[PDB]
Design a protein around this ligand. Structure first.
Ligand SMILES: Nc1ncnc2c1ncn2[C@H]1C[C@H](O)[C@@H](COP(=O)(O)NP(=O)(O)OP(=O)(O)O)O1
Ligand SMILES: Nc1ncnc2c1ncn2[C@H]1C[C@H](O)[C@@H](COP(=O)(O)NP(=O)(O)OP(=O)(O)O)O1
Ligand SMILES: Nc1ncnc2c1ncn2[C@H]1C[C@H](O)[C@@H](COP(=O)(O)NP(=O)(O)OP(=O)(O)O)O1
Ligand SMILES: Nc1ncnc2c1ncn2[C@H]1C[C@H](O)[C@@H](COP(=O)(O)NP(=O)(O)OP(=O)(O)O)O1
Ligand SMILES: [Fe+3]
Ligand SMILES: [Fe+3]
Ligand SMILES: [Fe+3]
Ligand SMILES: [Fe+3]
Ligand SMILES: [Mn+2]
Ligand SMILES: [Mn+2]
Ligand SMILES: [Mn+2]
Ligand SMILES: [Mn+2]
Ligand SMILES: [Mn+2]
Ligand SMILES: [Mn+2]
Ligand SMILES: [Mn+2]
Ligand SMILES: [Mn+2]
Lengths: 479, 479, 479, 479
């Protein structure tokens, strides 16, 4: 029978006993010890919430969406097997996040190990494998009608994508099932629905998307010889607003300039510790923070705990890492200098990121200042903000239906909706920080930065006239 | 001493005894009998809230904002007198709404009496006058340090605007006070703050704007020889999102196509009753629903009650009005045919509105029709959606300040914020309805409508290929 | 197919087309015009909510509870027919409330017509009959598998109770179905669940009962040869807290001394109008406010609108009624003198209520005062507060089950739960008010009242020493 | 100037720069790593909140309450100095909590070091001292008008109580200030207000106490030659409900039987690790988990992290500790056998707690047993549930005031409020668990347990007839 758990977002939810078995494992329970927002807790003190609760939510929403489709449309032949696979993928979709979540795959692994291209989602597929293999889960699957050769593959495909029609877990008459946990067509998935609601509750910013409404109006229809989830035509405004909410959440919380600096400092600490910490994996082999991702027995033990392991240590070889964490505790963070954006449809390419602190340091502002600054002293953090498909409008990849022909899919273009929608769907934000924290250096960094913005024809920083009054005169265009 | 009232949105609020005296009058209490959202209750069953509670909220917020400015900046010389006048203006700002709120000044008065320019806000100024004059309020003002020659004028000016520097109630060193209740500079006022939160709570759509945050970061600064309310620079995103919220509330709730059709039907009922209902005003004179606005003693008794007076009557001369309200009760509404918008910087002028049903009826669809339809059978509802200043971006009329120069006001342009903001700030939506409700007539109305949209080079209705498959191929612009 | 409606409490809910048909009738829609809390809106300005939305909620919760039982226990043979009947009874359970809800059957009908014993629930059964008969609903029932001889009876029985085993609508193997809408065994029904949540949302007092949790743990078991709803043993604390919440809601809101006085004043107004208002019922026959309950065509048109009909009238015969409503608008209410309770396990019997204002007026307080007072000047409002079964503990009438024997019903006594629970389950509150509102009379009424409390050996009013300092010395027991 | 922080419970709060300096210390920041509800997160997945955020809330509420008193009563002479000290005490009141909060002072320290009387509050006083002394805070206090000889003492006294009139930090004309952070008179303090709201928000149980209402109605009056905080007379019901809420929160959440068993298992782990984990304190001295409380430099590094340190270790001497934490991860918890209470004014004394597992193991059930169980196999957890003052009614220690004599304090007794209030204000709950988890041993533990309850004349467990049908007939008192 069912086990019931109380979640403040979703209320009392039922967990099928196979889900309980997956949950009550070291590999699942690890997620109690990884904060959803990483460094964002150090800005938003409500945001103590871990990946654990998020994962329970995704699993429950994934089952709500799949059940609702099955009730309304028996003709789809959604089996109890399908329902369970969707639920497990939801539950397990984030098992590969590392310490401070997106800090780990967004900043640490890319700087510490350029020789791999890794993502938490790959992590999740590997960790799922290890969880199943090391806890006897395969006979428990079989016991509920699942067929592991086929279903393990199905689950992994839902989490990460593929490993004509590119999937080995289900056929085209069940493609809709791939659109629930992680929707590669348009991004509209239950994962966003849970984190929207959960992050807002903890952050103290209020959610304006209604996922329940969306589920009541969803429906599977034929689109290009494949059965897909479509929304009612009238929900198009709400789907625009869903993506607008996502961007607003990034702007107010997830990319808060100080949350990002803290994530950068923790990443720096971890870089300075990577040579000297040892995590014991399979066969007693020793891994590093950056290689624990290659062995799931070691990765199991790599959580936000590592922050405190570094902070509390006495080993002299961790002094450098330790002193950075101490600077976070005392709130001697690197200083935010400002934000700018490129113009003229120009994009800053990933190759160039490492060059930008030099360019800032080589600016020649007319005003003379008490201290000169080297490239070492500047951080330039480039952030790619979008509607989750680079430059594309994701509502172009949604199918809709009308009350009068419920089985007939249609498209709806931007022009059919509103002229007050965004004109573009991707941009870049450049933040600049200084590691020298005294007033004299900060005043200098402000001059270098504003000169650099003038030199590159970037947008006038918002406080430009105030922080660099001698410099915003240079550009006639900034009257 | 203070009287405390419990409001579900704002919690326990303190009401100065002068405010109590204004509240406990028939002219104030009338607002318990006018629904905030008018016809919206007939679509959103939680929207039973009236103007009364909204008015208490505006009053309270207006005092919170004025106190917060006073606490932080004693140099502004905000007196207890000023605070109270701001509170009274907030409290009394909506005393001129009529039955079903915006239905009355947006639809009924314009059709019934085209020869007047009238708004609820002018109503409020006149009703405030009648309230003061008929309840002995002027001596109670004097009792608390107010000066009615000056302060009555101040209050009225805050509600309606003016009646060099155009105000007779306060000087330029107190201009900021005009920006609280009704902000003619940029629309950022406590009226929106209350209704956002109150409407959301009742509608069952969740608010994402945080008014308290904005008040913590507000500040008065000198801008162009006038003292004005300015926001912190970092709030600029939140202000863009405030206007986006307002627009989303209009699209989801306030302009819901069925909410609007109900308001239209009620307006029609009222038009057919206007000759035959008699409301007793000053000196026993008899007024009509359309002229009760010229006598505040009569207007006092004109509330949503009139709907029920019509619906419950037996007078044979109200049969026509009555039968329309019966059609609302049985849910035999006029039928929604669809929505379209103009293109290419075409704008539909107010003069033209009355012509549009004819143009729809004169569409000549190629496909034969079994029965014709006349202009009488069509409703065409034009809605001007904007960011509250016609085609202007209201954030261009906001002043900001920076952490490093808190007394120095600055401007922030669109391009300094984001490329994902709206490209325009006004549009028009055209909705078309049919009063003949059977399948045969609805099919026909769909053909006329879609043909008309093709004829005017308007946008393709979302369901066009479904409702008029013979017509959407004609038009090259839609493929 | 289903129609979806958005309710701020229950979110998006589905309405079966038979429910839509019942809803879209004059008899149902009338409930938009009757406030749930009656006079409580005049104290709690959020409490603008009508019976309409409450009724939709009860109907939806009734279906949630019946579906959940059917999913979990197929062996019960809960049919789609049963589900619909339960839903209709929920929907229609409050169709008999009159103006200001419980004011009408609690105060007005008892004073205006002692020759009937009437309740809103009888009203609901009669109004249900009229709605069905006058809107062609019987063939629409048949069309969905319902059998009206049997099912109409079932519905009515759920609302009002019966008209061995006392029911003609369903047998003992379906008794559980009578426990959903109005639970005569123990009061634990979906009606309380909706109003708890809905009243709290509008009042601005927060709900602490979780109905969803309760539904997840409910289960039908055999009890005394009848199938009944039982709760899990662990929910016993939550059922005590449910009734505690109900009592707290009565104390803070529903029996707020000023809400009750307003209800009393409106009742008085209606008493003074009952001879002079005419409501047209079936066959053109004229009914009164007090007799409209005998004809459902007339009752259909009797709503809170009557308040405004009286307030706005000019007929000289309604002057007396009108002037009372005017005193509410200006907030010249009768004055609250205080509260007391009986002691010594004594109960005040209903016979005696009319005698109590005399007894107060005949008190002989030692202090001499400027004005003497007659019985006419006092209101004594006796309120019977309980756990909804007079003196009984309703948790004694609940059956529970244990995780180890889910099909075996058990009892749980107070002593098995806690010693911090109430010792008794019913009491009486006596409120005394004065209709003379000047300071001199109020001071007098305070002396009479406190003397009366001393004379009857009632509890010392809370402010006794302050309002009647000369009198609380009389009783040594009040040191 | 002020720093603003966004808290999901209290919204945007202002922190004086002195508060910022206290906050940004390792001794304050440590609280980010101690869960408010300890083992409760392992039952309620929303309860990931730490002491840090609670501390910010207490600090903020403490200032709201002190400011509100100051605004309304200037005559009290509340200085900015006083306000800040109250804020600091609120902020710092919980700095002495250890790992898993109340698990540490409620269970671990009492078992590990029986020879000390220690509480988190004494911890807080010592940790506050270490924070001040090791971060140069005394000069920053002087900089803002505080006087450390006096004010440090004041702060400590607010947290812990005293160290005629027993306080050295403020005189009798400021006694009210001791009633804000930790109220030794009656327990009505801002600490409860914050945790009620914060725990509810995270637990997913809804709060029904309104702290803001209480603050609007609070007032200082003279009572017995001491100035104290008094409430309006009409709040007496709400104060009874406040304590009832606290008890309901304990019954539903804080004392959930599985929450308590997890805390017990963690405590057991810690007991088995105490000899082998070494924490570096002042002058390089090594401390244990149990002695880190004697050195604030060591205690600084003792947080929930220790759980993970044990679970991730390889030291063979932590195997025993480690295997217990493994049993938590796999959800092989000790098994709950049942709950009982004493009767007849029997009380279980703290001396006796350790004896109770033996008494259970020595029960001689008549029914044969296939296997015996030893004392070692049983846990008996005694919980003292009360209204925060052992057997006293805390409303007997509240002072009230009336509208007509706002400076005159009065008392209100139970019988003047209601007959539905608790008869007692303290009880004990006895929970019994078994460490042998198989069916055979659980069956046996159920017999021992129910026999023991029969032997001690304790209450019949709720499931008694089900778990021990051979035993509950024996006892005449249970039929
Ligand atoms: N009174 C209450 N109100 C709300 N949530 C509650 C609650 N009591 C517990 N929770 C939350 C905490 C959990 O997240 C969830 C389940 O707790 P249990 O219903 O106590 N289930 P368990 O497995 O202990 O008992 P058994 O095995 O006898 O069925 O409900
Ligand atoms: N326990 C409660 N909890 C929440 N709101 C409450 C409440 N009791 C009343 N309200 C709401 C109802 C109102 O919206 C507001 C004031 O009600 P009173 O404090 O009852 N004030 P009144 O003027 O009757 O008493 P006096 O004049 O003797 O002081 O709070
Ligand atoms: N964007 C929105 N967000 C939330 N609630 C909304 C909403 N739009 C409407 N509601 C609420 C208002 C109602 O209480 C409910 C249904 O409104 P519709 O989904 O607009 N249904 P209708 O019958 O107009 O269109 P059709 O016949 O084409 O299906 O949802
Ligand atoms: N748009 C937003 N909405 C809600 N909360 C927000 C928010 N942005 C931030 N927060 C939260 C995060 C924090 O809990 C709090 C303060 O964040 P800042 O206003 O960003 N203050 P900071 O110190 O970075 O800027 P400076 O020092 O230049 O003034 O509000
Ligand atoms: Fe996720
Ligand atoms: Fe307004
Ligand atoms: Fe009801
Ligand atoms: Fe605390
Ligand atoms: Mn993910
Ligand atoms: Mn994604
Ligand atoms: Mn207005
Ligand atoms: Mn406006
Ligand atoms: Mn009822
Ligand atoms: Mn009932
Ligand atoms: Mn504490
Ligand atoms: Mn305490």
């Amino acid at each position: 029978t069912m086990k019931v758990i109380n979640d403040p977002i979703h209320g009392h939810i039922e967990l099928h006993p196979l889900l309980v078995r997956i949950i009550n494992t070291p590999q699942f329970q690890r997620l109690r010890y990884i904060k959803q927002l990483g460094g964002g807790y150090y800005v938003f003190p409500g945001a103590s919430h871990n990946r654990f609760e998020h994962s329970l939510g995704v699993g429950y929403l994934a089952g709500c969406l799949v059940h609702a489709l099955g009730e309304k449309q028996p003709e789809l032949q959604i089996s109890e097997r399908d329902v369970l696979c969707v639920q497990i993928a939801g539950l397990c979709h984030d098992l590969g996040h590392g310490p401070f979540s997106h800090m780990f795959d967004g900043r640490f692994i890319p700087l510490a190990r350029p020789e791999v291209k890794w993502t938490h989602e790959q992590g999740s597929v590997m960790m799922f494998e290890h969880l199943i293999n090391s806890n006897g889960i395969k006979p428990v699957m079989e016991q509920y009608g699942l067929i592991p050769e086929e279903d393990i593959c199905f689950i992994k495909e839902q989490i990460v994508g593929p490993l004509l029609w590119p999937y080995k877990g289900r056929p085209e008459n069940k493609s809709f099932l791939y659109e629930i946990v992680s929707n590669k067509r348009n991004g509209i998935d239950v994962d966003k629905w849970d984190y929207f609601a959960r992050d807002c509750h903890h952050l103290g910013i209020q959610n304006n998307f209604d996922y329940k409404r969306f589920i009541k109006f969803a429906r599977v229809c034929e689109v290009d010889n494949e059965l897909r989830i479509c929304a009612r035509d009238k929900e198009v405004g709400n789907l625009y607003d869903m993506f607008h909410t996502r961007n607003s959440l990034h702007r107010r919380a997830y990319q808060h300039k100080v949350g990002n600096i803290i994530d950068t400092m923790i990443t720096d600490a971890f870089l300075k510790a990577d040579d000297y910490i040892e995590i014991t994996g399979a066969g007693g082999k020793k891994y590093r923070i950056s290689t624990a991702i290659d062995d799931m027995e070691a990765y199991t033990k790599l959580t936000d705990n590592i922050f405190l392991e570094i902070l509390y240590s006495t080993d002299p070889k961790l002094k450098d890492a330790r002193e950075i964490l101490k600077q976070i505790e005392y709130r001697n963070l690197f200083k935010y200098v400002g934000e700018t954006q490129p113009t003229g449809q120009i994009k800053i390419k990933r190759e160039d990121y490492e060059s930008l602190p030099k360019e800032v340091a080589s600016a020649k502002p007319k005003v003379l200042l008490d201290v000169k600054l080297k490239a070492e002293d500047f951080i330039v953090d480039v952030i790619n903000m979008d509607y989750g498909m680079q430059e594309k409008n994701p509502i172009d990849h949604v199918s809709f239906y009308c009350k009068t022909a419920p089985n007939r899919a249609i498209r709806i273009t931007k022009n059919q909706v509103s002229q007050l929608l965004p004109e573009k769907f991707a941009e870049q934000l450049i933040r600049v920080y200084c590691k020298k924290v005294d007033r004299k250096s900060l005043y200098a960094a402000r001059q270098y930065f504003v000169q650099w913005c003038a030199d590159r024809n970037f947008t006038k920083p918002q406080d430009g006239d105030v922080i660099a009054p001698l410099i915003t005169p240079q550009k006639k265009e900034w009257n």
